[PDB]
Design an enzyme around this catalytic site. Structure first.
Site, PDB file in Angstrom:
ATOM      1  N   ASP A 206      83.877 -41.645  63.602  1.00  0.00           N
ATOM      2  CA  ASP A 206      84.952 -42.379  62.940  1.00  0.00           C
ATOM      3  C   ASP A 206      86.304 -42.115  63.609  1.00  0.00           C
ATOM      4  O   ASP A 206      86.505 -41.090  64.266  1.00  0.00           O
ATOM      5  CB  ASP A 206      84.972 -41.972  61.458  1.00  0.00           C
ATOM      6  CG  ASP A 206      85.968 -42.751  60.610  1.00  0.00           C
ATOM      7  OD1 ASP A 206      85.709 -43.922  60.258  1.00  0.00           O
ATOM      8  OD2 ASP A 206      86.994 -42.150  60.245  1.00  0.00           O
ATOM      9  N   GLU A 230      84.281 -45.152  66.973  1.00  0.00           N
ATOM     10  CA  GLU A 230      85.043 -46.229  66.337  1.00  0.00           C
ATOM     11  C   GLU A 230      86.481 -46.119  66.824  1.00  0.00           C
ATOM     12  O   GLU A 230      87.296 -45.361  66.291  1.00  0.00           O
ATOM     13  CB  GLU A 230      84.913 -46.157  64.818  1.00  0.00           C
ATOM     14  CG  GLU A 230      85.444 -47.357  63.962  1.00  0.00           C
ATOM     15  CD  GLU A 230      86.734 -47.062  63.189  1.00  0.00           C
ATOM     16  OE1 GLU A 230      87.080 -45.869  63.008  1.00  0.00           O
ATOM     17  OE2 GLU A 230      87.345 -48.022  62.668  1.00  0.00           O
TER      18      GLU A 230
END
Ligand SMILES: *[C@@H]1O[C@H](CO)[C@@H](O[C@@H]2O[C@H](CO)[C@@H](O)[C@H](O)[C@H]2NC(C)=O)[C@H](O)[C@H]1NC(C)=O
Ligand SMILES: [Ca+2]
Length: 476
Positions: A206, A230
């Site tokens: 993330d 990400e």
């Protein structure tokens, strides 16, 4: 679990809290607006792995596993897993460490991989940043371990983006100071153990753009598996370089022209076509990226249009593009939720039908991709080549000569006229018989090497030499 191992994989991404309940209800309410735990569990996943594997996925990506802030914040519960505060404990909403280890096992028994979502940028806390009680953060118990409090205000300023905090004063995200070796030593030691304890095959990471670059290589090493990051930016200039620091990144550069090209009958094929070559040239390896058009951080594809022909075309692009396809649970049932929290719909409410229009499509696409990879060790490394476009059409080629899949995609939508595309550049031999593997018809190449591709109902077309399908179950 190695990056080479992952190129062949096809990922089904799901929210643990929203995919499948332990009791298997398909009627249990889950109101996305409430922003609360709806009761999906690790055990629930295990009991529906037939439905995930039946679309021909080989891997799942689950939302983070660490124990979350306990409160019901003004923005709801931490059902999503991104507000952690005890990293050596599990979120007990989803089950036991036994339950998690047992998920990694029902998967491996299936020749399938487990990808786990991990946050290293931040913790979560209920309330303003200036009111954070760091003693709750196990094991980052003091403010020394964290950046000074501030909000990110200009994403052009990459030095803010890495040092100021995400979130607001309603749910604040205390930003670990990933610069100082106390943090680096702790995370690296953490992740390898996480991977070991639960037999995690790969990691989705993330908010990578919010941690400075030189943190990540030790993290990727320490994890000892394929890591895909990400980096949420549509610009390849910005997002591709993060592949210099970890194995893959999610293919957000493709994401935007991909969506626009198919979200209406007049989307730009040019933009999609050009971004495919852009990423091919400029990203370090387009075959280690993740392709997607739906996730939990954007309105779903169907929130732009309910046209199933367009939905079929985009799902096909995702499977057959370079890299790892990533379908978002719900997309295969034509979910139409808008932005967060409306895109976190519970999957069980669909009733899990294995004959929905997009599930048959995604299965056929995965099927031909998995089979092609079976017979062609060059398929995952042969870079997707866009061989043709027009106003409503893009056609692309991937696979070793003689075994290539050639995919014709359209945005004419479900009321498209019936005509015949004369497709040059596919590379097949005159008179060679081709199987269109979505609708299971045959096409013959013909005298000059151009392929007469029947075009009807705005439907995708996915071509593969018929002689090479001798073994398979694909159209039999
Ligand atoms: C994986 O499991 C082991 C134990 O089975 C965890 O080991 C503990 O780690 C902490 C570090 O903060 C030590 O202080 C404890 O003494 C360890 N316990 C034991 C029994 O060895 C390990 O941290 C786990 N990894 C994760 C990511 O949860
Ligand atoms: Ca940061």
């Amino acid at each position: 679990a190695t990056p080479a191992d992952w190129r062949s994989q096809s990922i089904y991404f799901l929210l643990t809290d929203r995919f499948a309940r332990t009791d298997g209800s398909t009627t249990a309410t889950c109101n996305t607006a409430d922003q609360k735990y709806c009761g999906g569990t690790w055990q629930g996943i295990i009991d529906k792995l037939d439905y995930i594997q039946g679309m021909g996925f080989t891997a799942i990506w689950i939302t983070p596993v660490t124990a979350q802030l306990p409160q019901t914040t003004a923005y709801g519960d931490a059902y999503h897993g991104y507000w952690q505060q005890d990293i050596y404990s599990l979120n007990e909403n989803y089950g036991t460490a036994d339950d998690l280890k047992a998920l990694s096992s029902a998967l491996h028994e299936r020749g399938m991989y487990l990808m786990v979502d991990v946050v290293a940028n931040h913790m979560g806390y209920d309330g303003a940043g200036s009111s954070v009680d760091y003693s709750v953060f196990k094991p980052f118990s003091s403010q020394d371990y964290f950046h000074p409090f501030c909000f990110i205000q200009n994403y052009e300023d990459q030095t803010q983006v890495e040092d100021c905090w995400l979130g607001d004063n309603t749910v604040s995200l205390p930003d670990l100071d990933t610069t100082k070796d106390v943090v680096k030593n702790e995370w690296y030691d953490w992740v390898g153990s996480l991977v070991s304890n639960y037999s995690i095959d790969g990691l989705r990471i993330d908010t990578v753009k919010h941690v400075q670059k030189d943190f990540w290589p030790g993290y990727n090493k320490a994890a000892g598996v394929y890591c895909i990051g990400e980096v949420l930016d549509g610009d390849p200039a910005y997002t591709c370089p993060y592949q210099n620091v970890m194995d893959g990144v999610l293919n957000y550069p493709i994401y935007y022209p991909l969506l626009n090209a198919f979200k209406s009958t007049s989307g730009s094929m040019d933009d999609l076509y050009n971004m495919i070559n852009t990423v091919k040239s400029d990203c370090p390896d387009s075959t280690l990226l993740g392709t997607f058009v739906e996730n939990h951080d954007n309105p779903r594809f169907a929130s732009y249009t309910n046209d199933i022909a367009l939905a079929k075309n985009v799902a096909a692009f995702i499977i057959l593009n370079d890299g790892i396809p990533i379908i978002y649970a719900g997309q295969e049932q034509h979910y139409a939720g808008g932005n967060d929290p409306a895109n976190r719909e519970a999957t069980w409410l669909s009733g899990y039908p294995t004959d929905s229009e997009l599930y048959k499509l995604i299965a056929s696409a995965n099927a031909i991709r998995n089979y092609a990879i079976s017979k062609d060790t060059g398929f995952v490394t042969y870079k997707n080549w866009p061989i043709y476009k027009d106003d409503t059409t893009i056609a692309m080629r991937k696979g070793t000569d003689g075994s290539q899949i050639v995919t014709i995609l359209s945005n004419k939508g479900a009321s498209g006229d019936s005509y015949t595309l004369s497709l040059s550049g596919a590379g097949y031999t005159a008179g060679q018989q081709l199987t269109e593997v979505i609708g299971c018809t045959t096409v013959t190449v013909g005298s000059d090497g151009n392929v007469p591709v029947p075009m009807a109902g705005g439907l995708p077309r996915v071509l593969y030499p018929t002689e090479k399908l001798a073994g398979s179950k694909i159209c039999s």
